[PDB]
Design a protein around this nucleic acid. Structure first.
Lengths: 58, 159, 102, 169, 294
RNA sequence: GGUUGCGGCCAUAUCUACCAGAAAGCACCGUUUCCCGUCCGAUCAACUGUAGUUAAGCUGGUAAGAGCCUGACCGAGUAGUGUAGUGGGUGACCAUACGCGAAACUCAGGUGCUGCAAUCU
RNA sequence: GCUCAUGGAGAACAGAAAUCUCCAGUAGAACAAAAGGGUAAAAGCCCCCUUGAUUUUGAUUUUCAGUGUGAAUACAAACCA
RNA sequence: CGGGGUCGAAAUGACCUUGACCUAUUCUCAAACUUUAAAUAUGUAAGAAGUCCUUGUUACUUAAUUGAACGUGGACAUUUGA
RNA sequence: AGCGCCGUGGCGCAGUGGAAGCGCGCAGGGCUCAUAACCCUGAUGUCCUCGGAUCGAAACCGAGCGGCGCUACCA
């Protein structure tokens, strides 16, 4: 007793109800997936600049 | 059986081109890529490493990461009812820039030039683009340009 | 369901079974191999390959085939003998004369 | 005009296509190197057939490629055994040519019963300079049809040399 | 008949690139050499190109852009005579000298020469221009020989050693400088120094001088004119190395003329294209001659 | 402007048949002791730049040239296609309205440009 | 380092097909297989040396619930060719 | 140059015919052929999380106080970028 | 109609990618007054046809042709 195998009917109505929200883009994104060499240097550089700005205004 | 592979229904898509088989030219490699760069994606089937999926063929994305011979790209992808962020470690043979973004940057610096000139004279820049507005009146003459009366043509079989 | 009748081959013994047409039944990986013939000691067939003078092998199948082959070797005319390797239970099955390469 | 399009030889080559492999082929190689003073180069099959009784990569033949004064010396010895008489049928469509013969010992060889007898195929490649303009690695090029060589000029050269005639066709 | 290709063949034909039609490049190699780690975004990839004609040597420092390769330096056997060589402007020693010269030229224009002096006392050994401590790293350069056969005992590698002695960080290995015994993997620095200062050439000179004076006169004819010998050649090579380290600063010619004078004569002598109207005239004359029925 | 080297775009650059080529530069070319590779100093390595030739390569010009490229107020607003219609028709199909719009063909034109450096009467 | 299929023109035995030599040869071959893409100083043929078919665990893509499995991609720290 | 028919002794000698192959021409085609190539559908950008100038940081990168990433300070408004 | 098997000498039947086996039949010789049987000898197989892959097929995979077989139940 065969059946209805497949259909995409009504799926787009379902989606566009409350649908296709763009992903919330953020400042300062993930540094995962990024070259770890660059991650490491970026860490040390930020440590340096934080120290420098605090020493400029201590 | 049903066959759904990484390189399925891709024949004419990764068909290289006509009279452009063989290797790749060198600006593909001498070009530069930085974080925040927007890039197009067409795939070179002659380079079977670092390829994208056929979904990402002919698409557009942003860079997040850079390595020896490859580049990170972010894409948004419809999955059901949302756009998902998808990260690709692609090769520059498949990358190229977005001239739309290039022209946008040029428009930006020109807008800045206009703001500078209007700081110099206070002369009402009107920076924004505006559409092809509807056109204004005019007077067309007739000299050497008389109207030729036209009319339809009868039915000829033309065999 | 299938009635199957097959002869066990190293013995010559009939084997009748029956089982449904869709159930799995086992098969070995049998292969025959030709081998040359050398001076026959006691029952070990004195054979060899193109790259080996090996085969202190299957010990002389006692059949009329074995006896007729013994006589053919008594009158020479080297006989490329064929064997089979079903389940590592080797045995000689037939032979043919070197019509060339005398 | 003729500054340096004057003609010369590029190479002689000697081929021997033994029907099978074995000591006969080794002996043929011995013969060729005995003549040349330099070692020859063997030749393997291309595919398989029983009419000759052969297989793929079965060492059916041998040959050599030699040059220069030695090459032309061997050549004129071939010519004197060939009574300095040859064929336009033998000459090629380019000026290159050759001839296949028997009884190599005719070339003045101290025969040995071991080596036996072997027939041969001499072939001759003439040219003008620009050989490396085609046969080098850099700035490669296809020569001009003017500087090319042909059957007619080659046979004229070969006849006025030695005053040695050939057949009609 | 056979000397006529097809319209379809010539249509579907894909050209190679221009330099490949001309037989001058391997874009394989060019890619491998100029392509760069994209973390090093704009920092170029500096090739030391070397090339060998008949009667000349070229050594250049070259970079790569999108419009064309771009140059810093140059060096030429046909200007070595400033530094004191007259003959053998394509030999192993002249190659070494050119490499040394371009090295010192670059380090001159960039100030890396006082630091990374290079080498003056030469013996023929393998050692690279290892960096200074607490200072700028030496100039990293990569060899480009185009198509020439990497093979043991070549003037290209002679030039390479010249650069490395001149003070350039070129990466290499000692397994192709001549004297590199294959089975006993050791180089012979004394033989190498002999080839630097003209060992093999002096050996040829010596043997010809003892036996074959007719060839010693036929060639080395300039050496006959100049009264040269098997110590003078070493001494001039050494003094020329010193002069190279002294004043490598590329004094060019005077050119005797101007660009547009050269061009005036060349354009005068030049050919030119037969325009459309006179093409029509040409075919019409062909018609009136032959289609005019004689 | 010419030439050489490294080149970008990779046929307006290719292919074929011929014609010419000041200088310089390339190239052809001469040689085998030396490192080196070859059946072979032909290829490749090395030496001289001497012996000689611009014939070939190379550069350019010609061809109612093949090919390639561009454009058309050539074909063609055709074919196809989006949307609308209680439009027509038995139906296949079609026309109309608001819109987009090919390719082939036909004809005309063009036949490499150009960057860095060095060099040539 | 070489350039394939095929065709043409030659070379005794040798012929349609044996080996050698010249010209053209944009791929009409070959790449373990199915088919499809891709590839011409190569990814094909030959030659030389090797064992990165290695270790650490993570990230990513595809199928997808953004679970697994399988396969692949790009990196970091090592050891190697 | 496949088959042959003829002249004749035959002759890569001569002639005739016939399937091949070559040449350019012609008629018709392709969901699993294609140079070309739409319409419709589809991705991305249209700024403040931005642009410019200056100089701080780093064990990253550079031959290099060169570049990269993130920042200080300042400027760029009303049309803050269809 | 669907599915499966098989096509080998004149006949029958074997045959496993490097290349066809046997018997009976056939032919020749000899013995015999002649034919049989008998003894000595030899030969014969487009491996159903086309195509393919393979360096190469009877075999291995498609096309067709044929001789057969098996299926055919619940109504």
């Amino acid at each position: 007793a065969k059946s209805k195998n497949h259909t995409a009917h009504n799926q787009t109505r379902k989606a566009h109800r409350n649908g296709i929200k763009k992903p919330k883009t953020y400042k300062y994104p993930s540094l995962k997936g990024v070259d770890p060499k660059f991650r490491r240097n970026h860490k040390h550089a930020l440590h340096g600049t934080a120290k420098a700005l605090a020493a400029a205004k201590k | 059986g049903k066959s759904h592979g990484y390189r399925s229904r891709t024949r004419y898509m990764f068909q290289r081109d006509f009279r452009k088989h063989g290797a790749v030219h060198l600006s593909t490699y001498l070009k530069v890529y930085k974080v925040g760069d927007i890039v197009d994606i067409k795939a070179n089937g002659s380079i079977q490493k670092g390829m994208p999926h056929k979904f990402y063929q002919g698409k557009t994305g942003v860079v997040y990461n850079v390595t020896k011979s490859s580049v990170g790209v972010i894409i948004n992808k419809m999955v059901g009812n949302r756009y998902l962020e998808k990260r690709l470690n692609l090769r520059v043979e498949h990358i190229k820039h977005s001239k739309c973004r290039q022209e946008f940057l040029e428009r930006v610096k020109a807008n800045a030039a206009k703001r500078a000139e209007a700081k110099a004279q206070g002369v009402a820049v009107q920076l924004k683009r505006q559409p092809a507005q509807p056109r204004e009146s005019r007077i067309v003459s007739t000299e050497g340009n008389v109207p030729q009366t036209l009319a339809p043509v009868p039915y000829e079989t033309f065999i | 369901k299938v009635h199957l009748v097959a002869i066990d081959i190293f013995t010559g013994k009939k084997l009748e079974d029956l089982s449904p047409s869709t159930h799995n039944m086992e098969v070995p990986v049998v292969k025959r191999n030709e081998y040359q013939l050398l001076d026959i000691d006691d029952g070990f067939l004195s054979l060899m390959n193109m790259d080996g003078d090996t085969k202190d092998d299957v010990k002389a199948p006692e059949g009329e085939l074995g006896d007729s082959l013994q006589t053919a070797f008594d009158e020479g005319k080297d006989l490329m003998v064929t064997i089979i390797s079903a389940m590592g239970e080797e045995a000689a099955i037939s032979f043919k004369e070197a019509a060339r390469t005398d | 005009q003729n500054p340096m399009r004057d003609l010369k030889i590029e190479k002689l080559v000697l081929n021997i296509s033994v029907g099978e492999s074995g000591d006969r082929l080794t002996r043929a190689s011995k013969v060729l190197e005995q003549l040349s003073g330099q070692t020859p180069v063997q030749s393997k099959a291309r595919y398989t057939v029983r009419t000759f009784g052969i297989r793929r990569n079965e060492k059916i033949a041998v040959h050599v490629t030699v040059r220069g004064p030695k090459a032309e010396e061997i050549l004129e010895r071939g010519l004197k055994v060939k009574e300095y008489q040859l064929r336009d049928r033998n000459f090629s469509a380019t000026g290159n040519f050759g001839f296949g013969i028997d009884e190599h010992i005719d070339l003045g060889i101290k025969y040995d019963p071991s080596i036996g007898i072997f027939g041969m195929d001499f072939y001759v490649v003439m040219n003008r300079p620009g050989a490396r303009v085609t046969r080098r690695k850099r700035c490669k090029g296809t020569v001009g049809n003017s500087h090319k060589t042909t059957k007619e000029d080659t046979v004229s050269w070969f006849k006025q040399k030695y005053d040695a005639d050939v057949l009609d066709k | 008949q056979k000397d006529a290709k097809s319209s379809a063949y010539s249509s579907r034909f894909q050209t190679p690139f221009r330099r490949r039609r001309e037989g001058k490049t391997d874009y394989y190699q060019r890619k491998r050499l100029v392509t760069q780690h994209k973390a090093k975004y704009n920092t170029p990839k500096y090739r030391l190109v070397v090339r060998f004609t008949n009667k000349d040597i070229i050594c250049q420092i070259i970079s790569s852009t999108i419009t064309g390769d771009v140059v810093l330096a140059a060096a030429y056997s046909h200007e070595l005579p400033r530094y004191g060589i007259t003959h053998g402007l394509t030999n192993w020693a002249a190659a070494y000298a050119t490499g040394l010269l371009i090295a010192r030229r670059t380090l001159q224009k960039l100030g890396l020469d006082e630091t990374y002096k290079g080498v003056e006392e030469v013996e023929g050994e393998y050692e690279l221009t290892e960096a200074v401590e607490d200072g700028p790293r030496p100039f990293k350069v990569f060899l480009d020989i185009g198509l020439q056969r990497t093979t043991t005992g070549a003037r290209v590698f002679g030039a390479l050693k010249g650069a490395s002695d001149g003070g350039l960080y070129v990466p290499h290995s000692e397994n192709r400088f001549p004297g590199w015994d294959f089975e006993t993997e050791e180089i012979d620095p004394e033989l190498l120094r002999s080839y630097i200062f003209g060992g093999h050439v002096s050996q040829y000179m010596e043997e010809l001088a003892d036996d074959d004076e007719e060839r010693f006169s036929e060639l080395f004819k300039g050496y006959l004119a100049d009264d040269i010998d098997a110590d003078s050649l070493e001494d001039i090579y050494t003094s020329a190395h010193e002069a190279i380290r002294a004043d490598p600063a590329f004094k060019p010619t005077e050119k005797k003329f101007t660009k547009e004078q050269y061009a005036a004569e060349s354009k005068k002598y030049r050919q030119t294209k037969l325009s459309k109207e006179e093409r029509a005239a040409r075919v019409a004359a062909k018609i009136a001659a032959l289609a005019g029925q004689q």
